[PDB]
Amino acid sequence: DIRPARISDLTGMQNCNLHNLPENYQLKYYLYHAISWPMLSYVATDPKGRVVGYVLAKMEEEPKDGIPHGHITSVSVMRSYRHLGLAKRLMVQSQRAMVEVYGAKYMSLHVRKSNRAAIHLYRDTLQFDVQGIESKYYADGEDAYAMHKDFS
């Protein structure tokens, strides 16, 4: 059901976002970056091989002081498969690989201010802190919450 993401998963991934299309805006870019950090990014696949959820991530390329840290760049579970703990499961596997493989000291992400489900997922169940608002972060103008999880 869960396996590393591949370049050929792009179409399946796009199809997870049929009812929240802004998640496709940067998907290809983030997928290319994901692939260049093996073991960080995962797809969840139904009995027919169909992608029904995914997590994309990357390590910072030129970290300050050489201190490794990670970014979750996109996570999505199609509506049919939501509320099953799939996103939780994907995020945890990505987290564990960041720490165990690349020695991440922490991880960061951005989320739209209006994305109540994702904020709850990050803040309540995965215990991220909120650093603050990054004004006009998205191409369409919306602010992002900048969020962080320390692996200390």
Ligand X SMILES: CC(=O)SCCNC(=O)CCNC(=O)[C@H](O)C(C)(C)COP(=O)(O)OP(=O)(O)OC[C@H]1O[C@@H](n2cnc3c(N)ncnc32)[C@H](O)[C@@H]1OP(=O)(O)O
* Contact set for ligand X, span 58-117 (CB under 6 A): 72, 74-77, 82-88, 109, 111, 115-117
Regarding 15 and contact with ligand X (CB under 6 A), the answer is: no
Q: How far apart are CA 148 and CA 110, in angstroms?
A: 9
Residue nearer to ligand X on the CB measure, 102 or 138: 138
For the CA atoms of 7, 11, 16, 22, what is the dihedral angle to 10 degrees? 90
Residue nearer to ligand X on the CB measure, 65 or 138: 138
Cβ atoms of residues 43 and 51 within 8 Å: yes
HSE of 147, CA atoms in CB hemisphere, 13 A = 22
Regarding 136 and contact with ligand X (CB under 6 A), the answer is: no
| Interface ranges with ligand X (CB under 6 A) | 20, 23, 72, 74-77, 82-88, 109, 111, 115-118, 120-121, 124-125
